[PDB]
Amino acid sequence: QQEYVNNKQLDCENTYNSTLGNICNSIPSCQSYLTFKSTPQFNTPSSISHLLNSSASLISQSNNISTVQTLPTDTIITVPINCTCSNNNTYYQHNTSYTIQNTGETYFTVANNTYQALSTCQALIAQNPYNERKIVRGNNLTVPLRCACPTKKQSDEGFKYLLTYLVSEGESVSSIAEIFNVDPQSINEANELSSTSFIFYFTPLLIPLKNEPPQKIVKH
Ligand SMILES: *[C@@H]1O[C@H](CO)[C@@H](O)[C@H](O)[C@H]1NC(C)=O
Ligand SMILES: *[C@@H]1O[C@H](CO)[C@@H](O)[C@H](O)[C@H]1NC(C)=O
Ligand SMILES: *[C@@H]1O[C@H](CO)[C@@H](O)[C@H](O)[C@H]1NC(C)=O
Ligand SMILES: *[C@@H]1O[C@H](CO)[C@@H](O)[C@H](O)[C@H]1NC(C)=O
Ligand SMILES: *[C@@H]1O[C@H](CO)[C@@H](O)[C@H](O)[C@H]1NC(C)=O
Ligand SMILES: *[C@@H]1O[C@H](CO)[C@@H](O)[C@H](O)[C@H]1NC(C)=O
């Protein structure tokens, strides 16, 4: 289980435990997965791997695609990543780097737009030295991407991986669970939600997996 960010990552002026990162509460190193929607700029295994610090061969393997193909805009892909503990072993995160392309970008646009909510403004503020009001083109940010490793309880239940899923409008825990062939209660467990809680678009949600994720993700 990890606490759900619950749209606290919209409130960049305040610090919330969940927005600083998933807590290192299990094994210190594991294989994990992110998801990512291709865009005109990030439309190939090489460009996406560079942004997210994965490899083109891993993306090719996980999605059953060529390492050199383009992807139609808005294709959801899985991205295999290491997940390990960082910052005095406090957080599970996967580090990557991002150089600001245009002055005007902010910690929020980096976390929410460029990285599609795979990180948070608060984690970027906490883990970088730049004045949040004066970020400029060329600043090279460390971006702590959200991931986790299964807890002992989840492993005992048969979960091999956790995958960080990006919620879109019109999804429910049941529709997301159908993608991965898991019980939605296991998604609730993984995110410290109940069947009465809500999930929100443009937030990351951990999906516990018994097997590798499907090679093609279709929301509906
Ligand atoms: C956040 O975590 C710390 C230590 O883990 C502790 O203050 C408490 O459990 C949480 N509270 C707040 C206000 O963040
Ligand atoms: C995993 O960690 C190794 C060693 O730090 C690093 O070289 C590699 O880029 C990482 N790969 C992924 C997919 O996270
Ligand atoms: C990830 O980035 C943080 C913040 O700069 C750093 O403290 C940590 O050592 C990094 N972990 C790596 C590179 O494995
Ligand atoms: C990729 O992740 C590894 C740790 O797994 C880290 O050492 C390396 O600095 C990262 N690369 C980038 C470009 O941030
Ligand atoms: C967050 O990013 C999405 C694209 O991933 C964008 O559509 C949305 O406008 C951004 N959220 C805010 C509050 O600006
Ligand atoms: C930003 O830093 C990373 C390592 O933290 C490095 O791999 C990358 O080349 C740097 N970006 C630029 C544009 O120099």
Q: How many domains does the chain have?
A: 1
Beta-sheet pairing, 140-146 with 29-37: unpaired
Distance of alpha carbon 195 from the chain centroid? 23
Residues with CB under 6 A from ligand 4: 53, 82, 95-97
Q: Which of 35, 36, 113 to mutate to test the pocket of ligand 5 (most atoms within 8 A of CB)?
A: 113
Q: What is the resolution of this structure in A?
A: 1.5
Tokens at 46, concatenated: 């090489």
Range of the domain at 78: 1-220
User: Which experimental technique did the depositors report for determining this structure?
Assistant: X-ray
Does 142 contact ligand 3 (Cβ within 6 A)?
A: yes
CA–centroid distance, 171 to ligand 2, in Å, is 32
**Helix runs in 64-190, H state only:** 107-108, 121-127, 152-156, 173-180, 184-190
Does 8 contact ligand 2 (Cβ within 6 A)?
A: no
CA–centroid distance, 95 to ligand 2, in Å, is 9
CB 216: neighbour CB atoms within 10 A?
A: 13
Distance of alpha carbon 71 from the chain centroid? 19
Biggest alpha carbon distance in the chain?
48
